[PDB]
Design a protein around this nucleic acid. Structure first.
Ligand code: MG
Ligand code: MG
Ligand code: MG
Ligand code: MG
Ligand code: MG
Ligand code: MG
Ligand code: MG
Ligand code: MG
Ligand code: MG
Ligand code: MG
Ligand code: MG
Ligand code: MG
Ligand code: MG
Ligand code: MG
Ligand code: MG
Ligand code: MG
Ligand code: MG
Ligand code: MG
Ligand code: MG
Ligand code: MG
Ligand code: MG
Ligand code: MG
Ligand code: MG
Ligand code: MG
Ligand code: MG
Ligand code: MG
Ligand code: MG
Lengths: 52, 185, 148, 52, 58
RNA sequence: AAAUAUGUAAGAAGUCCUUGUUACUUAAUUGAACGUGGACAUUUGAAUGAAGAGCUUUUAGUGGGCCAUUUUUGGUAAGCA
RNA sequence: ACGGACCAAGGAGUCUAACGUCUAUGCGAGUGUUUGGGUGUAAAACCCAUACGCGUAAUGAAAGUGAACGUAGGUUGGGGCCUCGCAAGAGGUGCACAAUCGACCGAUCCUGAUGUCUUCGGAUGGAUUUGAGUAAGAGCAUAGCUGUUGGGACCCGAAAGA
RNA sequence: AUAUUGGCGAGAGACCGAUAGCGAACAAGUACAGUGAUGGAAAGAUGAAAAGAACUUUGAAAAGAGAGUGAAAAAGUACGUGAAAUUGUUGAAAGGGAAGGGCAUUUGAUCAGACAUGGUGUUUUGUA
């Protein structure tokens, strides 16, 4: 039973509707795995450099 | 001076505080290091060490292996402890209604256990159930079945899988392997 | 990465880990596979017995397509039935409804009898089957239909 | 739909949300579960007295 | 240029540095090398007694 | 025919008792080997010390040596070999 | 014995293809999206089908053959668990692992059943022989140190050859 | 559908930053060497703006001393910042065929902190 999530309006006041957690927020949080994945994926947008 | 009998400042050589930085795993180590300190049950000390082991030292344990252990006399209702991962086995067709505790359950293995009426349990839930390992059973996967162990200790008259990239005819099946060509091994 | 390399730890030490006497020359023993029947004989025989010489018969223009013959053991061959119908067929173990398993479609050429299939009669089609493999199949009440 | 849950598919072929290796992240609460308290032995004083 | 031919200096030091280990004898030593006529009998004798114990303890 | 060096042993994987196996062996329930079951426990089999014991993988450097007492070879001898 | 009159700046184990051991991670009898396609805030990120690569079967030069007699065996030693006992201890179960004897598959040498296009088929049962095998799978991918090879290959160095 | 260190036109980089990066960020394939084929550099930065020092004085002159511009001439066309080797002046110290160094101390020079604390308390002012 995901507890609830309050929904806000563009005017800043909470609306009547409330939604459950999408059950992905309960996934394990692994700082180590994210750190390794981030290190590799951040290298994907790179341009080659070389001396003549 | 001191006529030293043995090497000084020598490490114990046994891994403690496993070098993996899995924060959840460290919590499990944090839990059991408290148990083994203040429970005096030999089960806790065994499990604590088993958490430190490396990947090769934590071979997968098949569900078929679980079935064999439960078939032992007077072990049907015991709780199975697997410090590692549990892999599904399609070679088996009957599974009992046991409960098992393991670090990881593969999707196939977890489905098989649940479909058999049992439940998959994490190590912490075991601790609250059996703080001193009441009625438990620890299983270990095979270590020598690794491919790398085949080449270990290669030498004359040993037959220990010489390291090779490509296998087949004319790849190390000549002089030195048969008496028609020089000698045999 | 470089910053973890022992080279960074070898800065300031004159030999860079290569020692004083032996040093690190260009190619002290030779290049590549030199010395198999020579100064490197000891390693080659101890660790690679059977390297030198020819043993078999030559095959000209070998096409690795005639020899395509994947093997299947009897502990498998129930995975080839989808999980949805696997429970149905196992409990409804009877003839005149035996599931048809086309091992060729799965991409297997020969059936090998590793052992211990259940007592459910099944119909499996394969290009080849070993003796004991089929004896286990029809002992359960099944039969094999040879296909090509 | 994007990540799935215990009741819906994940919309990515053969994907399932990862599972936790530990039921909860609060070890102190478990240690105070009292199933363990009964099993546990009495404690010292956290600072061994300097003897001799 | 002449050079030292052979010597045994420092050898005992080297051997005793890791110690001279006993061969670590085992129970049930290997039957490799004993007379084969005894083996072919010994195989059937152990087969026979295995059946006898299995039936008696059954 | 020494001295110094050197192999082996000082138990539980032991001792004793009874009978099961075998195509081996015997003139033969005769033997052999492996066993079933039964009995003998810390003075369990000399001294001392054990700092933990056992085991695996991988790899660096090294592969020019020299000196001293004692034994000793060539040489007259050598800071000689 | 060699180099060093002095000072500033530059200056020497890197990168790659293929790999070995070990470690971490993900998945797990499977594993690998990024050849390519769709999509995009556009060399990023996200999604995707078929094959293919390695693994799940090995052994023979090859034709070929192909892994359960049995609780997937017996025996010995085993952490741990269970029972009794205050404990000491006694008994049971004993994964991984270690030793040993067996069992199954392939090769070699034998034995040669039922039969027959009468020369084909090889049943059955053995053998101080042999395999980089089976015996309720562990592998695939990524990354990291170290080590190897081919590369200018730690940096500078020929007399020569075309 | 494929190739393209050339040519033309564009967009970018966990690239280099004037001993680097093309040999060439500059009148660089230039100056220069060789009969010749060929070989081949060094060299970027005042200041916002020259406002680049009118004028006086000493000197033959270059320049110096003043004056002045400038936020700054400790930015003056030898010009941003201006290190080291090496040198001059000033100041201190020691020195009988080296100097330099290690331990401890004398002597000289030079240098930081601790010295309100809370508090008895109002012998008190700006009365708290
Ligand atoms: Mg000391
Ligand atoms: Mg050193
Ligand atoms: Mg080194
Ligand atoms: Mg050197
Ligand atoms: Mg060397
Ligand atoms: Mg030598
Ligand atoms: Mg000689
Ligand atoms: Mg003796
Ligand atoms: Mg070496
Ligand atoms: Mg060496
Ligand atoms: Mg040398
Ligand atoms: Mg000289
Ligand atoms: Mg020299
Ligand atoms: Mg000189
Ligand atoms: Mg420098
Ligand atoms: Mg695949
Ligand atoms: Mg495909
Ligand atoms: Mg391949
Ligand atoms: Mg066995
Ligand atoms: Mg390399
Ligand atoms: Mg050269
Ligand atoms: Mg001239
Ligand atoms: Mg200034
Ligand atoms: Mg300036
Ligand atoms: Mg300046
Ligand atoms: Mg200076
Ligand atoms: Mg003088």
């Amino acid at each position: 039973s995901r507890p609830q999530v309050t929904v806000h309006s563009l005017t800043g006041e909470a609306t009547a509707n409330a939604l459950p957690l999408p059950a992905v927020f309960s996934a394990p949080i692994r700082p180590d795995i994210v750190h390794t994945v981030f290190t590799s994926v951040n290298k994907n947008k790179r341009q080659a450099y070389a001396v003549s | 001076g001191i006529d030293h009998t043995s090497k000084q400042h020598k490490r114990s050589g046994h891994r403690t505080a496993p070098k993996s930085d899995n924060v959840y795993l460290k919590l499990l180590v944090k839990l059991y290091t408290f148990l083994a300190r203040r429970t005096d049950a030999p089960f806790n000390k065994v499990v604590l060490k088993a958490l430190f082991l490396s990947k090769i030292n934590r071979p997968p344990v098949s569900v078929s292996r679980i079935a064999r252990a439960l078939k032992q006399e007077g072990a049907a209702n015991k709780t199975v402890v697997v410090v590692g991962t549990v892999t599904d086995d399609a070679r088996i067709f009957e599974f009992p209604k046991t409960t098992v505790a393991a670090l990881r359950f593969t999707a196939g293995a977890r489905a098989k256990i649940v479909k058999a009426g049992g439940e998959c349990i994490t190590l912490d839930q075991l601790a609250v159930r059996a703080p001193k390992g009441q009625n438990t059973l620890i299983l270990r996967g095979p270590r020598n079945s690794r491919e790398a162990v085949r080449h270990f200790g290669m030498g004359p008259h040993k037959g220990k899988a010489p390291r090779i990239l490509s296998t087949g005819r004319k790849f190390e099946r000549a002089r030195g392997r048969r008496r028609s060509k020089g000698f045999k091994v | 990465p470089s910053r973890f390399t022992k080279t960074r730890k070898h800065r300031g030490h004159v030999s860079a880990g290569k020692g004083r006497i032996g040093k690190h020359r260009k190619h002290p023993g030779g290049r590549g596979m030199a010395g198999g029947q020579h100064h490197h004989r000891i390693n080659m025989d101890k660790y690679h017995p059977g390297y030198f010489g020819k043993v078999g018969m030559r095959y000209f223009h070998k096409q690795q397509a005639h020899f395509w013959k994947p093997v299947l053991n009897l502990d498998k061959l129930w995975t080839l039935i989808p999980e949805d119908k696997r429970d149905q067929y196992l409990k409804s173990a009877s003839k005149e409804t035996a599931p048809v398993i086309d091992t060729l479609a799965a991409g297997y050429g020969k059936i090998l009898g590793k052992g211990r299939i259940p007592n459910v009669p099944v119909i499996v089609k394969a290009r080849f089957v070993s003796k004991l493999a089929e004896e286990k199949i029809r002992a359960a009440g099944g039969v094999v239909e040879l296909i090509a | 739909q994007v990540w799935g849950s215990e009741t819906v598919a994940s919309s990515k072929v053969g994907y399932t949300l990862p599972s936790h290796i530990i039921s909860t992240s609060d070890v102190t609460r478990i240690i105070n579960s009292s199933e363990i308290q009964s099993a546990i032995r009495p404690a010292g004083q956290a600072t061994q007295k300097r003897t001799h | 240029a002449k050079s030292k031919n052979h010597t045994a200096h420092n050898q005992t030091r080297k051997a005793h540095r890791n110690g001279i280990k006993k061969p670590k004898t085992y129970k049930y030593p290997s039957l490799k090398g004993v007379d084969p006529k005894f083996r072919r009998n010994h195989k059937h004798a152990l087969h026979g007694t295995a059946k006898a114990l299995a039936a008696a303890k059954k």
